[PDB]
Design a protein around this nucleic acid. Structure first.
Ligand SMILES: Nc1ncnc2c1ncn2[C@@H]1O[C@H](COP(=O)(O)OP(=O)(O)NP(=O)(O)O)[C@@H](O)[C@H]1O
Ligand SMILES: [Mg+2]
Ligand SMILES: [Zn+2]
Lengths: 262, 576, 638, 417
DNA sequence: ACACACTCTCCAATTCTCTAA
DNA sequence: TTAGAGAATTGGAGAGTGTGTTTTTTTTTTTT
């Protein structure tokens, strides 16, 4: 997945009311065409029936954009893409960057040459009409209680961290203590610093502990980093309205933030 | 009775024949009968001045209109487009009654209202105010050319005004509105002006807004009726001004009336007074122009009221600008070039020295500018122009201003063991462009401390929210604007031998100590100071007394440049 | 415009709350009269005076504060009597010309404003005090004229209609008419109406009081008015919550039926089906493009728009709607009505009948007299007081009088095409009053008194022996028309027919045979006259609105229909495709449980139809067409 | 335009935003950055550019609806909007808010004995020792009456205070504590976290490549209190701008496309470190610190904090800390009383002038005998008036002048010695 | 070249009136 | 009593007319 639109409302049943005598009628609608009344049947006055937008009945729709995954590409080429439409229940179930399997109906539609004119082009545009898609306890408490009541549990829990690293036990203990933390005036949480030569396993250790905690974040002090430490304001690429982009430090509130090339 | 509002809106009521005629007669009778506190007719004088200068535009004050004919004052803001029409019709026949031939000059006269009490802020306008007379303030940012508009044809111009900077809250953004200027109001303003605008609030349909918002929302604009910045002296004003000039001690009264709350410092007040009135520019033979303005520099110890004097000068004068040290750039001081927002071409715009023009440009922390910014003012201070050649543009602009500056001595305190040049650290091409130079120092006399402290304590109890006698500040303001506009001193003769001998001797000594170098500029400076003293006395011709005053000021300010031990010998050398 | 607006100012001016007249105000109002005396047929001076708002601005202060000058008071009263005269009387009709229509509407607008302005109780108070003084004289012609013009002034004020379309008020709120009526009570002016109605020598004024009283009560029907009582607050509160509940429930149910009928997938999901074997209008099978669920209730016409009717082809419609006034007004009206019936009805009716009989050259409006007896008899019967309270009207002369008036209206409606609508309205009013007479004689039969029962037999005997009453219903049914009368007339006519047949049947049971104007009577032969197929068409039209018809209406029509079909054996006259369409809709509606008699009768007659159709296939043709009596009887023979 | 609040945004998601519409009496009741609750209804708005009417024409990967007369042969599309009928945050005012309980409390405070020390204890309960600092910082909250001279120039109201000390000790505690207590206050440092820093700056707006201003800390702290940490280390650009901001209480800009005067009316409380970390007890403050004489001469009061490792003192501090972790007037009483006190505008008495001028003369001749400027006389007036205001006295009686002189004299003596 | 808005015309549907079945 | 033919008024089916429609050079502030 690459991008997901805002939610789009869609008409189902139009509500018409007479300006002259307030008589009302409902029109079930036909593959996008509305059968507008010509005359009010009660008061026999032509061109007097008006569509009431907020009394009509609506449904939800969303537009999703998807790309072929990098594994199945021919060598050195750029990837292809398709457009998916999802209705009602399915209308908000995926987010950018993740990967899915989708089943749907392969539709094709003509397009108009200009918004005023009624001529259509001779080459059609196709899209997928989505039908289904798939992404690719007391027992635990008692186990935890028994394990906590076992001796040298502090050493054991520390030992469990980063099995690729064979000797730095007290560093693992410090990291474990940071993950547990104090409790709530004064700053209750803990901050730790790792120093020494480049090429040492410290970055791997950051990436390991980052993957252990739900509210975690990871970035670099270099300007090439994917997300900044500083909050800023920018124009939305879709609407070109302003949006406030908070930095990694804010997002990791009540969480751990790993910083590299500090 | 005109007040009998029944069964009709006021717009409908004043449309009726009976009420229209009553309003017409009441305004006409008000024009002929209105009297000042002295028993003088006000509008006889004002109409006669309008006719003598062919100006075709009559100003009325809301306050005394209300005070004498309240019923009309009550209707006026509720239906302005009706009562203003009736008022125009009534004024023209009074003018023709007094001056029967004036229809040869014009066939219409416009009445303009002033001092309307119900001022509103530029962001507090609401639909409650539509089609009523209002008053607001702001600074002009955009201003079209003057164009002709159908009616016959008349002048038309459109402007955009926004909230004055520093009246918006910190870090947020200003609101703005559009206004329309018709007939004699065009070129009553230019970009960067701050103005007071009285007008009618008016709205109309616009399809662009309806399609942009999706709701049936209208656009609005202000029709201007009177515009004024935030001479018109009466006979009584010029009479009192001219009568004051008879006093042989007028110099003491004017000098003692500058920055009144500052105790002591006689020399500073005198120097600032001469710079405030100024000498006269001239161009003998057409090929040799020379400037009129008198520049001033102040330097000395901290806590001696240097910054305070500039703020007073900013308040008493008109067309004044104030700026500080690192807060200004070379480009901001002179003029700048930009890609124009809507014309999409390179354009040139005025900086501080151009925007001030025939006014005062005040600088503070002059010691702490970047040197590359401070050297931008050399042309404007002497040649009195600003020449630019950038981005295909090649042009020059007027820079006809007076510069006043304040600085600190090197290391924070002045040493009398060293000369001015040794203590200030400014180069000769800068030092020589200031006409008056002053040095201010700490002193430690106990009686002077007691007097100063007692005066300051007295000042604090005096201003709680609750020498000769000085003038009221409004009288002094009237005096300055009269003197600069109605008197132009002529130098018909003076003693060349006396000045030449003194100058040669002075220059020779300046070579000896090197405290300041003395050049041709000093002679021309004394001519400027002599004319300024002549102007303070409202005299058309320079006389012997003026030349002696100029020489005294010049030599007194020069002796202070020297080392303490040398000053005694120098003072005895130049005995006057 | 400006000329009148400038000159009319002369009357005076207002100082806070004290009004100061000008010293020549009398001459000034005389000049206003001189303006009106030379006014245009467009009523331009009246529109100008209205625009200047002279009546509201000056005349009300003059009447309230300066009435001590009796000549000035008289001048002001007569001036505003001329100004307030109803627009229909001023123009003579609602104009056809658009310019005169605009002037009429503007004049009526100013009259509406005057009616609102007159709501101040002080005016009615001064008027009542003045009138109280005048009646103490037991007088000069000018005194009689002042009484006359006072009565006509309040008449004119009451007469101009309220714009319910402007007000759009909810029930139990006060309209302009309601507030003004309450002001009549608050002024005590009503007491003088009851004096004038009850005092014998004031008969010349009683005719005017009839118009005043009948103008007041227009919005309230006597049955619901008799219903009111002090506990109505909680009753309306609780009932309104229940009404709101059922309304919400109905909308929910209907929504869900539509929701199930529609498919679940979106409107562009597509698909197409062939209905194999079902041929088109063309040579081949139908192709169906809509959703699968729609075939469960398919009819091919669902895609078609209705036929566009011509302008002049439209039927008549009601220009009025049911209402209820504020509870304070309802209580006051009930008290006044009770006191009028207690003191004034018989004396006023005798006086009005005397004037209508004597004064034929004056062309007094008989419809008010019939309205008043129709209203007060219904109120009296709803309260079930003794018949003695309405004694004067309980005589044969009333039946003959209203029969000749109603038949005159019928003949005029047929002959006088240029006014047939108004003649129909007059005829409808007469029919309503006649129905109340029948209800009254029916009620006294179930009284405990033999004397009034014998009087009832005497009246009913004359009504059934004479031709006119038994022939009249058939005469009205024969000439009912959709342009001529709205369906309300048909409802009243058929319900009155049911009541007439009920009393006729009860009267026929008294002897072995009834003889009438001369022939031996037969009830079944009389009912055979109603077997005309036009009458059945009118009945079927009234049946289309059975859900909106009253319970009594539905009972009456279905009872008469079953009797006519079953006992006369004319059943096949009801075998009609239009009727069968209505039966289909009837049995389809889930609300059928409320209409047991109607659905059982429908299934019964359809059973007869299918029993015949099983033998004879020609019934499918006969179903399209209306039957002559001979055809109805021949269909069973085959 | 509104956006999802920080509490709702699901992890990894981009924020969603919505258009809200306000009408009639609710207009301009919310500013950018505010967090509010809105009540109303969700509605559907058509594309008005494609409809046509007798009054006005139509202007002109999805499709809209079709088949209305007003729409011709075009197609119509909708969008979602939220119509809000109500919005709320998520001298006479004192009379309206203070009940009889609050009136009784401020009256009891006005009648209190040794109220000065009681308020010091109440506002700074955590602090140990250092009463002079507590008295000095407490007086700053009461300010001093500003005055406008008849010719239009104005005289400074706020006092400014400076604290120098060793990085190990109390100076940081005062700043963060008063900031937590006080309304409408700003914390910052000479090593500021923005391009603006302590005073306004110019930035080019990419929406037009046009130059505009951006606010610094002293603009936002207008009409409030400003706390500056590590003040000994500061940018030169701000240091020059501070010269004007300290006394003139304004900021002046003159650069390409921008010319303005901006307000900076503020009371400053500054914290600084001496050279080599620990204060040299043998040397004056002016020898110890980094600040220049022009900036240093601006402050009305100075104080010095330096540690020494006394065992009992260390043990007491440790026990205080651990006991605090183990666990007269409330802060709202101080707030209510302070807002009550700041409405008084006491005058100086005629007799007080003699004492004031005498004390200034004594100080000046002492300075001349072994430098003091006119600014010190102003500070005497400001401090004494603040004392009178804090006791809610009607005029500046001599008892206030004596203590004000004592504080100033002790500060200057320990600055010099 | 292909869509709205407006103006205008002629053909024949609906009702009145007189007549025969 | 029920139904068809000749004359008058009116609706609307249909035609005609007018109009609209990323990629380069230069400046200014502040970051280095
Ligand atoms: N003689 C005086 N009379 C009245 N007020 C004075 C006097 N001398 C100093 N002050 C006050 O001292 C304060 C500082 O004034 P200011 O003009 O900034 O002096 P300064 O020498 O320019 N200080 P600085 O800018 O650091 O060199 C102001 O409040 C002045 O009003
Ligand atoms: Mg200064
Ligand atoms: Zn309708």
């Amino acid at each position: 997945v690459i991008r997901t639109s805002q939610l789009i409302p869609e008409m189902q049943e139009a509500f018409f009311q007479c300006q002259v005598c307030a008589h009302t009628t409902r029109v079930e609608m036909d593959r996008g065409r509305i059968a507008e009344p010509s005359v009010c049947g009660r008061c026999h006055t032509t061109h007097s029936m008006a569509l009431i937008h907020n009394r009509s009945l609506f449904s939800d729709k969303q537009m999703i954009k998807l790309q072929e995954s990098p594994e199945d590409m021919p060598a050195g080429q750029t990837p292809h893409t398709v457009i998916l439409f999802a209705h009602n229940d399915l209308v908000d179930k995926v987010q950018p960057g993740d990967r899915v399997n989708v089943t749907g109906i392969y539709r094709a539609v003509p397009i108009r040459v200009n918004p005023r004119v009624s001529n259509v082009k001779s080459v059609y545009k196709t899209h997928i009409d989505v039908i289904h898609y798939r992404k690719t306890s007391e027992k635990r408490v008692e186990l935890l209680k028994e394990l906590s009541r076992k001796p040298d549990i502090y050493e054991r829990l520390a030992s469990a961290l980063a099995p690729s690293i064979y000797e730095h036990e007290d560093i693992k203990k410090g990291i474990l203590l940071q993950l547990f933390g104090g409790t709530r005036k004064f700053r209750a949480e803990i901050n730790i610093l790792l120093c020494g030569d480049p090429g040492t396993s410290k970055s791997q250790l950051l990436q390991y502990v980052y993957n252990l905690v739900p509210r975690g974040q990871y970035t670099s002090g270099k300007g090439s980093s994917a997300v900044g430490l500083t909050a800023y304001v920018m124009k939305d690429p879709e609407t070109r309205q302003l949006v406030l982009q908070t930095g990694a430090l804010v997002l990791s509130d009540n969480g751990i933030c790993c910083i590299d090339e500090f | 009775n005109l007040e009998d509002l029944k069964g009709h809106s006021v717009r409908e009521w004043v449309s009726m024949a009976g009420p229209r005629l009553e309003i017409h007669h009441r305004f006409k009778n008000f024009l002929r009968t209105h009297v000042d506190s002295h028993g003088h007719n006000v509008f006889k004088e004002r109409i006669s001045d309008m006719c003598k200068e062919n100006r075709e535009s009559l100003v009325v004050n809301y306050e005394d209109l209300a005070a004498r004919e309240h019923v009309l004052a009550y209707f006026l803001p509720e239906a302005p487009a009706e009562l203003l029409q009736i008022f125009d019709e009534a004024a023209l026949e009074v003018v023709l009654a007094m001056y029967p031939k004036y229809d040869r000059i014009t066939n219409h006269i416009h009445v303009r209202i002033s001092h309307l009490p119900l001022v509103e802020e530029l962001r507090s306008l609401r639909q409650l105010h539509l089609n009523q007379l209002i008053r607001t303030s702001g600074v002009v940012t955009s201003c079209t050319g003057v164009l002709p508009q159908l009616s016959i044809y008349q002048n038309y111009q459109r402007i955009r005004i926004q909230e004055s900077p520093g009246k918006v809250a910190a870090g947020r953004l200003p609101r703005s509105k559009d206004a329309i200027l018709l007939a004699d109001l065009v070129d009553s303003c230019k970009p960067g002006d701050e103005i007071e605008l009285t007008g009618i609030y008016h709205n109309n349909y616009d399809g662009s807004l309806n399609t942009a918002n999706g709701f049936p929302v209208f656009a609005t604009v202000i029709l201007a009726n009177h515009v004024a910045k935030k001479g018109e002296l009466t006979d009584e004003d010029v009479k009192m001004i001219t009568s004051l000039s008879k006093d042989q001690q007028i110099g003491e009264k004017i000098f003692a009336s500058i920055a009144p709350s500052i105790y002591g410092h006689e020399d500073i007040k005198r120097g600032l007074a001469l710079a405030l009135f100024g000498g006269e520019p001239k161009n003998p033979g057409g090929k040799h122009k020379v400037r009129g303005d008198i520049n001033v520099l102040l330097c000395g110890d901290p806590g001696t009221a240097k910054s305070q004097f500039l703020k007073y000068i900013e308040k008493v004068s008109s067309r004044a600008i104030f700026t500080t040290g690192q807060g200004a750039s070379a480009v901001g001081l002179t003029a700048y070039v930009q890609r124009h927002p809507v014309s999409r071409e390179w354009t040139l715009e005025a900086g501080a020295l151009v925007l001030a023009d025939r006014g005062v440009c005040l600088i503070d922390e002059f010691d702490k500018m970047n040197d590359q910014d401070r050297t931008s003012i050399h042309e404007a201070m002497e040649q009195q122009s600003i020449s630019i050649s950038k981005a295909g543009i090649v042009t020059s602009l007027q820079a006809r201003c007076t510069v006043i500056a304040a600085a600190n001595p090197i290391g924070g305190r002045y040493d009398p063991s060293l000369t001015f040049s040794e203590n200030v650290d400014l180069t000769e091409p800068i030092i020589s462009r200031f006409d008056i130079l002053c040095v201010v120092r700490d002193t430690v006399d106990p009686v002077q401390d007691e007097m100063l402290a007692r005066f300051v304590v007295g000042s604090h109890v005096r201003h709680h929210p609750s020498g000769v006698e000085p003038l009221p500040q409004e009288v002094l303001k009237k005096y300055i604007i009269y003197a600069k506009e109605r008197v132009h001193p002529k130098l018909n003769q003076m003693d060349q031998d006396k000045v030449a001998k003194m100058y040669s001797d002075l220059r020779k000594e300046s070579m000896a100590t090197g405290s300041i170098p003395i050049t041709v500029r000093h002679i021309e400076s004394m001519i400027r100071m002599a004319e300024a003293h002549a102007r303070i006395h409202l005299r058309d011709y320079v006389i012997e007394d003026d030349v002696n005053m100029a020489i005294r000021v010049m030599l007194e300010s020069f002796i202070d440049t020297q080392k303490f031990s040398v000053m005694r010998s120098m003072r005895k050398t130049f005995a006057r | 415009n400006c000329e009148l607006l400038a000159t009319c100012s002369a009357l005076g001016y207002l100082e806070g709350d004290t009004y100061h007249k000008e010293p020549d105000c009398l001459e000034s109002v005389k000049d206003l009269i001189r303006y009106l005396r030379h006014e245009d047929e467009t009523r331009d001076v009246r529109q100008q005076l209205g625009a200047a708002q002279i009546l509201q601005s000056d005349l009300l202060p003059i009447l309230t504060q300066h009435h001590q000058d009796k000549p000035l008071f008289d001048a002001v009263i007569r001036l505003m009597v001329n100004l307030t005269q109803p627009a229909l009387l001023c123009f003579g009709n609602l104009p056809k010309e658009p310019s005169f229509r605009h002037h009429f509407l503007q004049v009526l607008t100013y009259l509406q404003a005057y009616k609102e302005a007159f709501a101040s109780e002080k005016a009615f108070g001064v008027l009542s005090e003045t009138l109280y003084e005048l009646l103490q004289l037991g007088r000069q012609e000018e005194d009689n004229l002042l009484i006359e013009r006072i009565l006509l002034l309040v008449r004119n004020i009451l007469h101009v209609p309220a714009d319910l379309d402007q007000e759009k008020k909810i029930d139990d709120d006060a309209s302009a008419h309601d507030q003004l009526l309450w002001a009549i009570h608050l002024s005590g002016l009503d007491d003088l109406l009851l004096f004038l109605a009850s005092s014998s020598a004031e008969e010349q004024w009683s005719l005017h009081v009839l118009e005043i009283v009948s103008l007041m009560f227009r919005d309230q029907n006597p049955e619901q008015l008799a219903g009111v009582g002090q506990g109505r607050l909680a009753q309306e509160r609780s009932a309104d919550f229940a009404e709101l509940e059922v309304l919400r429930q109905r909308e929910m149910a209907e929504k869900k039926t539509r929701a199930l009928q529609r498919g679940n997938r979106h409107s562009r999901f597509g698909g197409s089906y062939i209905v194999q074997g079902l041929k088109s209008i063309g040579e081949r099978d139908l192709i169906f493009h809509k959703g699968l669920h729609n075939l469960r209730n398919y009819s091919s016409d669902l895609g078609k728009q209705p036929k566009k009717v011509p302008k002049r082809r439209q039927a008549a419609r009601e220009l009025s709607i049911q209402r209820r006034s504020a509870l304070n007004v309802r209580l006051f009206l009930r008290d006044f009505c009770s006191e009028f019936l207690e003191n004034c009805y018989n004396r006023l009716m005798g006086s009005v009948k005397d004037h209508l009989l004597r004064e034929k050259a004056q062309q007094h409006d008989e419809t008010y007299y019939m309205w008043a007896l129709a209203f007060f008899m219904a109120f009296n019967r709803a309260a079930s007081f003794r018949p003695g309270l309405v004694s004067e009207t309980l005589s044969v002369r009333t039946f003959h009088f209203i029969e000749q008036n109603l038949t005159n209206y019928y003949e005029m409606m047929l002959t006088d095409r240029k006014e047939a609508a108004s003649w129909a309205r007059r005829m409808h009013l007469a029919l309503k009053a006649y129905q109340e007479l029948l209800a009254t004689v029916n009620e006294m039969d179930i009284s405990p008194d033999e004397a009034v029962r014998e009087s009832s037999r005497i009246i009913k005997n004359n009504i059934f022996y004479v031709m006119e009453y038994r022939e009249l219903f058939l005469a009205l049914f024969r000439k009912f028309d959709e342009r001529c009368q709205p369906r309300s007339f048909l409802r009243d006519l058929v319900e009155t027919t049911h009541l007439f047949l009920k009393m006729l049947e009860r009267f026929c049971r008294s002897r072995g045979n009834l003889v009438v104007q001369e022939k031996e009577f037969n009830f079944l032969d009389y009912l055979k006259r109603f077997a005309c197929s036009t009458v059945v068409r009118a009945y079927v039209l009234l049946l289309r609105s059975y859900q909106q018809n009253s319970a009594h209406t539905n009972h009456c029509i279905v009872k008469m229909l079953h009797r006519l079909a079953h006992d006369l054996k004319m059943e096949a006259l009801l075998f009609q495709l239009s009727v069968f369409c209505l039966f289909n809709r009837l049995l389809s509606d889930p609300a059928a449980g409320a209409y047991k008699e109607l659905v059982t009768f429908a299934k019964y007659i359809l059973g007869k139809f299918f029993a015949l159709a099983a033998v004879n296939q020609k019934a499918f043709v006969e179903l399209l067409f209306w039957k002559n009596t001979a055809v109805v009887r021949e269909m069973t023979e085959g | 335009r509104i956006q999802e609040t920080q509490a709702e945004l699901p992890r990894g998601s981009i924020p969603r935003s919505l258009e809200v519409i306000l009408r009639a009496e609710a207009v301009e009741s919310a500013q950018a950055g505010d967090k509010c609750d809105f009540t109303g209804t969700l509605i559907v708005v058509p594309d008005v550019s494609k409809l046509s009417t007798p009054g006005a024409r139509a202007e002109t990967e999805t499709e809209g609806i079709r088949g209305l007369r007003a729409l011709g042969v075009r197609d119509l599309s909708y969008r979602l909007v939220f119509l809000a009928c109500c919005v709320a945050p998520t001298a006479e005012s004192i009379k309206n808010q203070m009940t009889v309980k609050e009136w009784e409390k401020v009256f009891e405070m006005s009648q209190d004995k040794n109220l000065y020390h009681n308020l010091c204890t109440s506002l700074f309960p955590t602090i140990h020792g250092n009463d002079e600092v507590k008295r000095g910082v407490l007086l700053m909250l009461f300010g001093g009456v500003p005055k406008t001279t008849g010719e239009g120039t104005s005289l400074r109201g706020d006092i400014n205070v400076c604290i120098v000390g060793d990085p190990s000790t109390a100076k940081s505690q005062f700043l963060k504590h008063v900031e937590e207590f006080s309304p409408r206050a700003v914390y910052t440092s000479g090593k500021a976290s923005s391009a603006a820093g302590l005073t306004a700056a110019v930035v080019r707006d990419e929406e037009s490549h046009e130059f505009v201003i951006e606010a610094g800390a002293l603009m936002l702290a207008d009409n409030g209190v400003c706390c500056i940490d590590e003040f000994d280390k500061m940018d030169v650009r701000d240091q020059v701008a501070i010269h004007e901001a300290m006394e003139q209480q304004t900021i002046s800009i003159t650069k390409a496309g921008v010319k303005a005067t901006l307000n900076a009316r503020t009371s400053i409380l500054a914290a600084a470190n001496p050279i080599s970390g620990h204060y040299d007890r043998s040397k004056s403050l002016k020898q110890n610190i980094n600040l220049s004489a022009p900036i240093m001469s601006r402050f009305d009061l100075f104080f010095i904090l330096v540690d020494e490792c006394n065992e009992v003192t260390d043990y007491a501090i440790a026990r205080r800390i651990v006991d605090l972790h183990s666990r007269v007037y409330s802060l709202d009483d101080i707030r209510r009383y302070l807002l009550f006190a700041r409405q008084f505008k006491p005058k100086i008495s005629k007799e007080s002038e003699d004492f004031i001028v005498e004390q200034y003369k004594h100080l000046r001749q002492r300075d001349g005998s072994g430098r003091i400027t006119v600014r010190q006389l102003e500070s005497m007036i400001r401090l004494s008036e603040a004392m009178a205001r804090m006791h809610c006295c009607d005029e500046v009686q001599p008892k206030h002048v004596k203590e004000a002189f004592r504080l100033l004299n002790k500060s200057i003596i320990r600055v010099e010695t």
